[PDB]
């Protein structure tokens, strides 16, 4: 088995982070920041 | 998902409640709690234990003959989904529950005359 | 004839009905008009494997089970069908002939209301009950005194 | 001499010492790394653990056995009244941290 | 390929090594004595154990005499220890029982007496083909 | 400066279908022997000078007890950070049906019948988290954003709830609402007495 | 038109599929390959439903039906029943039955005209079978096996039975069913015909290990493709069958 | 008395249920299935002396005739006269029914 510290596993995780989870997390961050900025400007 | 009923006592068996006994003849017995499960394993008759719907129906303390009890059944022939049919079914369930409660109160008063 | 040879004889034997009749078949007419699927055909039919491959592959693609539903109105294909209502099963109450039975129930309800089925109904009796309760309290106090002594 | 049969350690040395916590309120040891290109947002919050209950989930997990099926799962409820912001601390970088 | 099946969810194992279960098929054996469990891990002092749907290695203590001299692969189809399925249902059978198979999962017998578990039926297609009722 | 003297609700920091980290102090157990503190094997029955112990704490050199040997001491009340906990619902306290789903139409709140045991009622916004968290009831919990970008499909899954249990946790509660309990039981003696 | 296929590297197609003359039921899996085999053979002529029965994927051995009806066991849920009812047209009657032997694909084998059942089914269950399926019901055992739905594949064209069936038993069964029957095997010598394959009046799907002689036997007995007949077995394929299965 | 009353409620100490006893009395096929789940040579009296009501095998005909005079056999008779509890009675207790169309 490849360990959690394996280089290939790290590269796989980095590609997943850059291409898949990244846009979803970015959209969630935009929505949450817009709501909290609405509170801040209110 | 759906709401079962306890085999022993008849209480509403919600998901992740109780335990099911699988008998080798093909019978599944659902119990709502370990009280009913242990009484079943001790082979106590539910019809004799006064805290059960079985005893209450045997003794005639439950309203059993009424038109409002003919609306709930295990439907073995499925119906194609229809939004208006489900909505009018929901309204029917609410009104039937009200009528059943009122007639049950009348039944209890005729028990306690 | 040896056992193995009778076994292969039973394998090559074809049993037929003695009357010589045949059962009616029910092949639909579109089977004759179907064009056979070819992988190398550029105008081949797009399959669920093709859609799954285009939308993430196996284990990523999420199939839509309600896509092929046949309903009276196709707007209802993605509804959240109710299941539980106030501790009761909706599927227990789903019945195509629900309105007629409910209207009959309403007629029955107004009939018993006119007949007086839900109708609801002495100072001397209240006095004698209060006197009996006072006597029971005095009896309890006497028993408590006896228990103390 | 050596052990005749191998066996792993009982417990983890990563969580030593097994002592009482120095504070009742939990300490955020690390915050997420700051990215100046992101919009401004808060990184944490507080609540009070109320208890747990049960749910039924409609599972959409492709490749799993319970895909398109209902699953019963335990969930924990945390009561979260809104916080009140009352202060602002500034932090500089030093060769000591 | 060893006899440990793939795609099995975690369940409470009720039958350790040394347990005698009933033999639920018509192979001629009446009981099965567990001596090993396929796919068991290595841990000091821990007895290997299996649940419904697992393959075990079992000898025959009671039954047809020419079955009594060999070690057979078997699939546990019923267990008495209660376990939970993913729908939140805790359940149990009234006995522990298994069926003799080969390492490919095909059954030695031709009929199954009584019900089988959903786990065993879903993991072994021949047991699902020879089951009359699945619970 | 814009946020001074202002209330911040939980749904402007966290969102449903997010995986967060939970930081809390664990349940205290006081002074505990090695058997429950570390999971060591019990010694055989009637072992002289105790069997809930470790037989050898240093059979070899150095002439010291080493720091890696299990000892009786404080168990629990430890600081813990547990990661990757999924938010299943952020319910609003002003919603009278925040335990209602799209398929369960019972208008009910998250509080069980009889209240949460040893807590009370949840009357504010609440966060439903899959699984268990390090604290106990009444304990202050810190919810933190995940430090890294997630690598699991579970963090990207969308959660669809069908039913939330609201029966009593003070026993084998079989009813979700008081109306359901009264409908099942029927009319009691105290009902006509009142 | 007999097609070799597999459900997740398993040759037991009849365990995971149910094929009639008006619909097809396929088990939900982690991929679309098993669905797409049936989709390629049936290009929207009859509907294909990805379905689950009792939370399991053994729908072929748990469900029984023909072009007129469908029977599901008592542990089928309301949502699975609603999904099946919404996926199939109103010409097909779907009923959930309370039969003790809930493996309906094991205890019932049927075509559009007749149905053989396990001999210990209930009388009202026989009534429901004869009502919903609209067929004549017979209690019969095939090669001393009470699981007729797993040890026989049946269509309106013909039938393939357990290889160890006696010749007089095949004669009596063929006279009772009105279709020609042949004793043969699937999946390289497996005797579980119903668990190994599914069939309707113009399509058969067997496992990938089904050899060429027994595939030709299936083709001839079920009259699949151009110039296929059960009389070819003892004339044209006789030497091949004797060479292979001696 | 009961042998080993401490483990009397274990699943491995379970006895046959009363509804199964009624079904054995009503239909000999169900009783024959139950008897085929046993081995005849390991039974008391080689399985020749069986009480369906008590669901129990006996070593001799005089032993069977003997237990019939006892009160456990009479308790089983009165329980069968009252009728055992089934799922049909369970549904009738709550007013539930089956709709088969
Ligand atoms: Zn109960």
From Swiss-Prot, chain C:
Record's subcellular location: Nucleus, Nucleolus
Domain of life: Eukaryota
Primary role: Involved in the biogenesis of the 60S ribosomal subunit.
Sequence similarity: Belongs to the TRAFAC class OBG-HflX-like GTPase superfamily. OBG GTPase family. NOG subfamily.
Name of the protein described by the UniProt record: Nucleolar GTP-binding protein 1
Species of the source: Chaetomium thermophilum (strain DSM 1495 / CBS 144.50 / IMI 039719)
């Amino acid at each position: 088995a490849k360990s959690a510290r394996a280089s290939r596993i790290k590269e796989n995780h980095q590609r997943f982070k850059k291409n898949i989870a990244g846009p979803v997390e970015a959209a969630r961050l935009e929505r949450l920041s817009a709501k909290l900025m609405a509170i801040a400007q209110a | 998902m759906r709401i079962e009923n306890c085999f022993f006592c008849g209480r509403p068996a919600w998901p992740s409640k109780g335990i099911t006994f699988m008998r080798n003849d093909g019978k599944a017995f659902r119990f709502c709690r370990s009280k009913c499960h242990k009484n079943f394993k001790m082979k106590r008759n539910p019809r004799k234990l006064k805290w059960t719907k079985a005893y209450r129906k045997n003794a005639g303390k439950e309203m059993v003959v009424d038109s409002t009890l003919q609306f709930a059944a295990r439907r073995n022939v499925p119906v194609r989904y229809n939004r208006e049919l489900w909505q009018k079914t929901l309204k029917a369930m609410e009104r039937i529950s009200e009528i059943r409660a009122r007639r049950e109160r009348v039944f209890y008063k005729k028990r306690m005359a | 004839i040896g056992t193995r040879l009778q076994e292969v004889m039973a394998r090559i034997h074809v049993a037929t009905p003695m009357d010589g009749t045949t059962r009616e078949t029910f092949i639909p007419e579109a089977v004759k008009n179907l064009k056979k699927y070819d992988k190398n055909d550029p105008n081949r039919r797009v399959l669920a494997r093709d859609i799954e491959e285009a939308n993430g592959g196996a284990g990523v693609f999420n199939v839509d089970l309600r896509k092929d539903w046949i309903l009276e109105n196709p707007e209802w294909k993605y509804d959240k069908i109710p299941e539980i209502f106030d501790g009761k099963n909706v599927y227990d109450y789903i019945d195509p002939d629900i309105d007629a039975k409910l209207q009959a129930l309403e007629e029955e309800e107004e009939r018993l209301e006119k007949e007086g089925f839900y109708d609801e109904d002495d100072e001397e009796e209240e006095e004698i009950l209060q006197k009996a309760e006072y006597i029971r309290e005095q009896h309890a106090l006497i028993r408590n005194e006896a228990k103390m002594r | 001499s050596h052990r005749k049969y191998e066996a792993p350690r009982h417990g983890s040395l990563a969580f030593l010492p097994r002592k009482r916590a120095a504070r009742h309120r939990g300490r955020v040891k690390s915050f997420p790394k700051d990215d100046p290109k992101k919009p401004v947002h808060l990184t944490a919050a507080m609540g009070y653990k109320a208890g747990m209950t049960t749910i039924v989930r409609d599972l959409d997990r492709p490749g799993a056995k319970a895909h398109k099926k209902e699953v019963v799962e335990a969930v924990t409820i945390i009561d979260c009244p809104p916080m009140v912001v009352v202060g602002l601390v500034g932090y500089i970088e030093t060769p000591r941290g | 390929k060893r006899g440990a099946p793939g795609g099995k969810l975690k369940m409470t194992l009720g039958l350790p090594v040394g347990a005698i279960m009933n033999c639920a098929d018509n192979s001629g054996a009446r009981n099965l004595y567990i001596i090993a469990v396929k796919g068991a891990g290595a841990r000091l002092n821990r007895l290997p154990a299996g649940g419904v749907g697992d393959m075990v290695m079992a000898t025959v203590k009671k039954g047809k005499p020419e079955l009594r001299k060999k070690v057979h692969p078997a699939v546990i189809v019923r267990q008495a220890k209660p376990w939970k399925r993913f729908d939140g249902v805790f359940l149990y059978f009234e006995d522990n029982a298994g069926v003799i198979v080969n390492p490919k999962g095909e059954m030695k017998g031709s009929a199954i007496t009584g019900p089988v578990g959903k786990e065993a039926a879903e993991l072994w297609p021949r047991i699902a083909s020879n089951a009359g009722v699945v619970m | 400066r814009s946020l001074f003297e202002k209330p911040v609700t939980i749904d402007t920091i966290f969102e449903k279908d997010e995986m967060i980290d939970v930081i809390a102090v664990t349940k205290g157990h006081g002074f505990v022997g090695v058997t429950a503190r570390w999971g060591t094997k019990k010694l055989p029955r009637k072992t002289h000078k105790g069997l809930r112990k470790v037989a050898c704490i240093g059979a070899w050199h150095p002439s010291h007890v080493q720091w890696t040997v299990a000892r009786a001491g404080q168990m629990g009340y430890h600081h813990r950070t547990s990661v990757n906990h999924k938010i299943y619902r952020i319910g609003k306290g002003d919603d009278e049906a925040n335990a209602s789903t799209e398929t369960d139409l019972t208008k009910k709140k998250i509080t069980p019948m009889g209240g949460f045991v040893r807590y009370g009622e949840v009357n504010n916004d609440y966060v439903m988290i899959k699984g268990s968290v390090p604290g106990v009831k009444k304990r202050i919990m810190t919810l933190r954003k995940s430090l890294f970008t997630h690598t699991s499909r579970k963090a990207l899954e969308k959660v669809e709830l069908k039913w939330i249990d609201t029966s009593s946790e003070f026993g084998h509660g079989a009813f979700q609402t008081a109306a359901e309990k009264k409908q099942f039981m029927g009319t009691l003696k105290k009902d006509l007495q009142t | 038109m007999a097609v070799r296929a597999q459900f997740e590297n398993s040759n037991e197609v009849g365990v995971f599929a149910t094929l009639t003359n008006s619909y097809c039921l396929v088990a939900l899996g982690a991929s679309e390959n098993f669905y797409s085999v049936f989709e390629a053979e049936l290009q929207d002529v009859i509907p294909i439903c990805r379905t689950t029965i009792a939370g399991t994927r053994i729908i072929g051995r748990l469900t029984a039906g023909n072009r007129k009806g469908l029977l599901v066991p008592t542990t089928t849920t309301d949502q699975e029943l609603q999904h099946l009812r919404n996926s199939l047209p109103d010409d097909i009657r779907i009923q959930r039955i309370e039969e003790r032997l809930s493996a309906l694909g094991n205890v019932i084998v049927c075509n559009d005209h007749t149905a053989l059942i396990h001999p210990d089914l209930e009388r009202e269950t026989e009534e429901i079978i004869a009502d919903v399926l609209g067929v004549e019901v017979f209690r019969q055992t095939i090669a001393d096996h009470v699981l007729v739905g797993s040890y026989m594949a049946l269509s309106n064209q013909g039938g393939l039975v357990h290889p160890k069936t006696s010749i007089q038993d095949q004669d009596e069964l063929s006279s009772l069913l009105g279709v020609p029957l042949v004793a043969g095997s699937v999946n390289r010598g497996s005797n579980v015909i119903g668990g190994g394959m599914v069939v309707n009046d113009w399509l058969a799907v067997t496992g990938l290990d089904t050899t060429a002689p027994e595939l030709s036997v299936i083709e001839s007995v079920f009259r699949l493709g151009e110039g296929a007949g059960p009389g070819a077995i003892n004339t044209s394929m006789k030497n091949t069958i004797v060479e292979s299965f001696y | 008395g009961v042998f080993a009353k401490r483990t009397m409620t274990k699943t491995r100490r379970r006895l046959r249920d009363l509804d199964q006893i009624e079904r054995d009395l009503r239909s000999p096929r169900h009783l024959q299935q139950y008897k085929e789940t046993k081995a005849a040579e390991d039974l008391p009296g080689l399985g020749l002396y069986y009480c369906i009501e008590c669901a129990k095998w006996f070593e001799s005909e005089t032993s069977l005739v003997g237990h019939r005079k006892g009160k456990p056999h009479k308790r089983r008779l009165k329980q069968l006269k009252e009728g055992a509890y089934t799922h049909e009675e369970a549904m009738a207790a709550i007013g539930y029914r089956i709709d088969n169309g």
